[PDB]
Design a protein around this nucleic acid. Structure first.
Ligand SMILES: [K+]
Ligand SMILES: [K+]
Ligand SMILES: [K+]
Ligand SMILES: [K+]
Ligand SMILES: [K+]
Ligand SMILES: [K+]
Ligand SMILES: [K+]
Ligand SMILES: [K+]
Ligand SMILES: [Mg+2]
Ligand SMILES: [Mg+2]
Ligand SMILES: [Mg+2]
Ligand SMILES: [Mg+2]
Ligand SMILES: [Mg+2]
Ligand SMILES: [Mg+2]
Ligand SMILES: [Mg+2]
Ligand SMILES: [Mg+2]
Ligand SMILES: [Mg+2]
Ligand SMILES: [Mg+2]
Ligand SMILES: [Mg+2]
Ligand SMILES: [Mg+2]
Ligand SMILES: [Mg+2]
Ligand SMILES: [Mg+2]
Ligand SMILES: [Mg+2]
Ligand SMILES: [Mg+2]
Ligand SMILES: [Mg+2]
Ligand SMILES: [Mg+2]
Ligand SMILES: [Mg+2]
Ligand SMILES: [Mg+2]
Ligand SMILES: [Mg+2]
Ligand SMILES: [Mg+2]
Ligand SMILES: [Mg+2]
Ligand SMILES: [Mg+2]
Ligand SMILES: [Mg+2]
Ligand SMILES: [Mg+2]
Ligand SMILES: [Mg+2]
Ligand SMILES: [Mg+2]
Ligand SMILES: [Mg+2]
Ligand SMILES: [Mg+2]
Ligand SMILES: [Mg+2]
Ligand SMILES: [Mg+2]
Ligand SMILES: [Mg+2]
Ligand SMILES: [Mg+2]
Ligand SMILES: [Mg+2]
Ligand SMILES: [Mg+2]
Ligand SMILES: [Mg+2]
Ligand SMILES: [Mg+2]
Ligand SMILES: [Mg+2]
Ligand SMILES: [Mg+2]
Ligand SMILES: [Mg+2]
Lengths: 150, 103, 109, 141, 117, 54, 48
RNA sequence: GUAACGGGGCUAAACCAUGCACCGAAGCUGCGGCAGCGACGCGUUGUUGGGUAGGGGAGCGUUCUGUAAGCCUGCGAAGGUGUGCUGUGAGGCAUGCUGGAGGUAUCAGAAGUGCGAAUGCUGACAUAAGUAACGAUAAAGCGGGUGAAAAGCCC
RNA sequence: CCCGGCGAGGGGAGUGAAAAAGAACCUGAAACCGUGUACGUACAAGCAGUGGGAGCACGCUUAGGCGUGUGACUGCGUACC
């Protein structure tokens, strides 16, 4: 806190509580007793615990009929209207689409649909598999995920 | 006419028609209850005193309501000894209406 | 129909003004004006101007007649205090409060 | 709920007692009992349920032992050094009604209600009272 | 994650001040004083749930004594007599009968005297 | 010398039980002018007991 | 399986002690330090 | 200041002996309820539950992140102030009035997470009190003027 | 427009969804200070409550009582850290 180190008043004789610093945390405008500093909140996740969690999640998506496997998933042009119609045809709304290789047309078409997300198989994460209502995987994506987790 | 009977470890002086709050009975509302052990029946100058119970004395009553009484607060406090404790209490009761007194 | 007048931020403590207010509470306005005329207090001057304003309000705005009016309610509330410093001996400072009052008079028939 | 006497529906009767030859303190306990209403089934601690009692011949009340000469009544005037005393015999000569009144007052509850109870005691030095209109019943203590 | 205390602090103080309604002066107005008053009121109430049972029994006994002595027997002999007669009517009821049914009370005294004779 | 305990609003009020002002009992009326005045004082218009004194 | 239907294993998340937060906590006032002496003090205690 | 029975009073209402009654506690019993521990019928039985330092266990509520582009909300959010109901407690719920735009279930996650004290810190407001005092005891009086008003200004 | 000193301040009128949004301006807590009403209180002794409890007032209405406020009288009772 900005200010002098001068003792505000003498130790004895004034009839006031003893003071030492104008910056005392007891005082208005004083320091914070246990002032925060920038923190790293990241945790270690054991590799096997990470992989074990993904296998649990994927297995539960299958049991709940939230994993949908397709042969191919793509759009003709980078047009949001095309992807929106395709998902309407499939009865999909809130969907994570996992491809073996992420198409530029499908990327751009999905970007302005907040319910939709398009990933490569390498970019799966545990929260996203749980967060979206349905997960659409291409056949090629399933093999890469199989190979990744084993 | 009145009679005296025991229920819920306490005694009650009752007449026909009056509602009496007792300790909780395990008897559904609407059902009849009979208090078989009558300590006294006084019709007028006719006074039957049980020794301890009046022979053939029965009070019949209908269970009107079950409920919980007014909340009482328990406060415990030991000054200068850093000890305080609070607790609430509501006592269960059964209300019964006296339907018949028969000596 | 009740008619009000107020003097807000009047320069007097409420305690002093209330001494005068208590003289006229419930009186006919003609009697109240006479009482205030012969009360030798600064607050009598302040209260009399508020009462006269309330009467004028009642006649002009509400179509009353002075003959029927009584002082139905009167009260003095504490206004903001002005804080001032008074030097005392040995370099010590005291706070002076210059107290103010809000005077309300209600007249009605 | 247990019965409580009500001040405005209490039945208070009038009695007359002759103090002649009665032992002071044994008379006083019976007066105190009846002024409080401890003799009634409607007795209620916070209510004066007691009776009005006339005491005649207060100057002829008896005491045992050497108390007539040796029993001392002390009081202080509130002025420093103002401790005063009178023997029983001096009290009987000067102010005989005070002997019974003092004895009874000390046996009544302390506080407003006890003072109210004491107002029902009417003590006389001699054999006559002015309360024929109240029709007091004779009471043998 | 800074937490301001005002809303919760106000609710706690108001809860205490509500329980101090009717108390004199600072005891119904000032939190510090009201809090002490409310704790003490709780301490007394706990104590007096026990004292109430003592005070009522004391009252019933005094009234039974008066009613018994009007019928020519002391409380202590009366209770002994009822116990020897196997009468189990408690003091709350005896005191109630003493006030409200004088004739029934006399019958109880006669039962007690007969058991003693 | 100073208080050991803060006096109450009750005690403040009790002390002030003698502070109330007394209104003038009644005004007198000049015989001539009809003006109300304080008894034994001249009127606002300078009358006293009927005579234009000032 | 949603982000608002996941729970930790029973026993896996014990709440930390919070000293000096009133009588009911059991760690109010002195905060488990007892009364006075070097060990009660901030920074207090002897070396290994 | 009685002042060496707690008092009144007492010749027993004292003392000794014997006896039977009664009063008397949060003790014991009765009735209703809650919880801990010991065996398991996941039945009910035995028993326990005063506590400072202190150890152990289990919770309430607050702000913030996700769940939430969800849900509630101008047909009235938060906050304020009443009232009723409710739980063993921290508390919770409902609703009148005020308010006039926000709030946020659930399950998780993180803490600037709970104040009556520290001659604590800041602000506000009391008390004493309409009390002390109005600052040299060189001193004022009156007439006229002006003014809403003049002991104090002007003449 | 009106009272007032061609004041301060206020009452109307008007604006506005709202003016107890009027510039001493969102909300508007608490201490503290008032006005009004109900009840208590001038023979009474102390941590000011608590247990008991009459009376009065005002609501409800099986018309039995109940609710709310007050609290005469009385047992017990020396704040907190
Ligand atoms: K600074
Ligand atoms: K998207
Ligand atoms: K420790
Ligand atoms: K609201
Ligand atoms: K949430
Ligand atoms: K402080
Ligand atoms: K003052
Ligand atoms: K009391
Ligand atoms: Mg700072
Ligand atoms: Mg790695
Ligand atoms: Mg200087
Ligand atoms: Mg006593
Ligand atoms: Mg914040
Ligand atoms: Mg208040
Ligand atoms: Mg004065
Ligand atoms: Mg401990
Ligand atoms: Mg310490
Ligand atoms: Mg030590
Ligand atoms: Mg130590
Ligand atoms: Mg240090
Ligand atoms: Mg002496
Ligand atoms: Mg007992
Ligand atoms: Mg026990
Ligand atoms: Mg049991
Ligand atoms: Mg125990
Ligand atoms: Mg324990
Ligand atoms: Mg959130
Ligand atoms: Mg908020
Ligand atoms: Mg509310
Ligand atoms: Mg904190
Ligand atoms: Mg504070
Ligand atoms: Mg503390
Ligand atoms: Mg001050
Ligand atoms: Mg003084
Ligand atoms: Mg003086
Ligand atoms: Mg002076
Ligand atoms: Mg000067
Ligand atoms: Mg002049
Ligand atoms: Mg001068
Ligand atoms: Mg001059
Ligand atoms: Mg103006
Ligand atoms: Mg706004
Ligand atoms: Mg505002
Ligand atoms: Mg009176
Ligand atoms: Mg007297
Ligand atoms: Mg009186
Ligand atoms: Mg006194
Ligand atoms: Mg009570
Ligand atoms: Mg006492």
């Amino acid at each position: 806190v900005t200010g002098s180190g001068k003792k505000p008043w003498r130790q004895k004789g004034t009839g006031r509580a003893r003071s030492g610093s104008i910056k005392s945390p007891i005082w208005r405008s004083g320091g914070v007793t246990f002032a925060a500093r920038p923190q790293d909140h990241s945790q270690k996740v054991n590799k096997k615990m990470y992989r074990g969690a993904l296998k649990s999640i994927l297995s539960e998506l299958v049991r709940q009929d939230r994993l949908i496997v397709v042969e191919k998933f793509s759009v003709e042009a980078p047009k949001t209207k095309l992807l929106a119609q395709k998902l309407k045809d499939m009865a999909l709304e809130d969907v994570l689409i996992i491809t073996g290789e992420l198409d530029e047309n499908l990327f751009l078409a999905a970007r302005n649909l907040h319910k939709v997300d398009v990933r490569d198989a390498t970019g799966i994460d545990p929260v996203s598999l749980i967060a979206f209502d349905k997960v659409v995987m291409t056949a090629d994506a399933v093999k890469q995920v199989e190979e990744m987790l084993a | 006419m009145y009679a005296v009977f025991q229920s819920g470890g306490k005694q009650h002086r009752v007449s026909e028609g009056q509602t009496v709050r007792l300790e909780k009975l395990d008897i559904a509302t609407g059902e009849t209850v009979e208090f078989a052990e009558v300590l006294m029946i006084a019709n007028g100058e006719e006074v039957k005193i049980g020794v301890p119970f009046v022979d053939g004395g029965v009070i019949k009553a209908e269970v009107v309501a079950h409920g919980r009484g007014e909340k009482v607060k328990i406060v415990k406090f030991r000054r200068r000894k850093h000890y305080r404790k609070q607790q609430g209490h509501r006592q269960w009761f059964t209300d019964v209406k006296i339907t018949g007194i028969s000596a | 129909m009740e008619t009000i007048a107020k003097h807000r931020h009047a320069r007097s403590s409420a305690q002093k003004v209330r001494l005068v207010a208590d003289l006229i509470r419930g009186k006919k306005v003609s009697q109240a004006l006479d009482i205030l005329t012969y009360t030798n207090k600064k607050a009598a001057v302040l209260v009399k101007k508020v009462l006269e304003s309330a009467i004028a309000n009642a006649e002009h705005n509400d179509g009353a007649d002075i003959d029927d009016l009584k002082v139905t309610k009167i009260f003095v509330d504490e206004g903001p205090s002005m804080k001032r410093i008074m030097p005392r001996a040995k370099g010590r400072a005291d706070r002076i409060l210059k107290r103010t009052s809000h005077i309300t008079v209600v007249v009605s028939d | 709920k247990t019965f409580t006497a009500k001040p405005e529906t209490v039945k208070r009767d009038w009695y007359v007692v002759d103090a002649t030859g009665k032992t002071l303190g044994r008379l006083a306990t019976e007066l105190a009992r009846r002024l409080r209403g401890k003799h009634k089934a409607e007795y209620t601690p916070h209510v004066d349920t007691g009776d009005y009692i006339i005491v005649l011949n207060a100057d002829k009340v008896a005491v045992t032992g050497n108390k007539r000469t040796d029993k001392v009544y002390y009081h202080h005037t509130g002025h420093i050094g103002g401790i005063k005393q009178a023997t029983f015999e001096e009290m009987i000569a000067r102010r005989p009604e005070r002997v019974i009144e003092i004895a009874v007052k000390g046996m009544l509850p302390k506080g407003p209600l006890g003072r109210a109870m004491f107002r029902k005691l009417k003590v006389y030095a001699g054999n006559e009272h002015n309360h024929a209109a109240q029709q007091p019943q004779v009471l043998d203590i | 994650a800074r937490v301001k205390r005002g809303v919760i602090a106000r609710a706690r103080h108001k809860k205490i001040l509500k329980q101090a309604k009717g108390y004199y002066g600072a005891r119904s107005r000032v939190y510090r004083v009201a809090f002490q008053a409310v704790i003490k009121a709780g301490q007394y109430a706990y104590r007096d749930r026990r004292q109430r049972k003592r005070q009522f029994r004391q009252l019933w006994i005094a009234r039974i004594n008066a009613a018994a002595r009007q019928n020519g027997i002391s409380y202590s002999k009366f209770i002994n007599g009822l116990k020897k007669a196997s009468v189990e009517i408690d003091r709350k009821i005896l005191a109630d009968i003493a006030v409200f049914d004088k004739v029934a009370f006399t019958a109880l005294v006669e039962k007690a005297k007969a058991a003693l004779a | 010398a100073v208080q050991q305990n803060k006096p109450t609003r009750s005690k403040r009020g009790m002390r002030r039980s003698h502070d109330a002002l007394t209104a003038v009992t009644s005004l007198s009326v000049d015989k001539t002018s009809g003006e109300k005045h304080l008894r034994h004082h001249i009127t606002a218009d300078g009358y006293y007991r009927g005579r234009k004194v000032i | 399986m949603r982000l608002n239907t996941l729970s930790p294993a029973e026993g896996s998340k014990k709440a930390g002690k919070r000293l000096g937060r009133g009588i009911g906590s059991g760690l109010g006032k002195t905060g488990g330090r007892g009364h006075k002496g070097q060990k009660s003090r901030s920074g207090g205690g002897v070396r290994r």
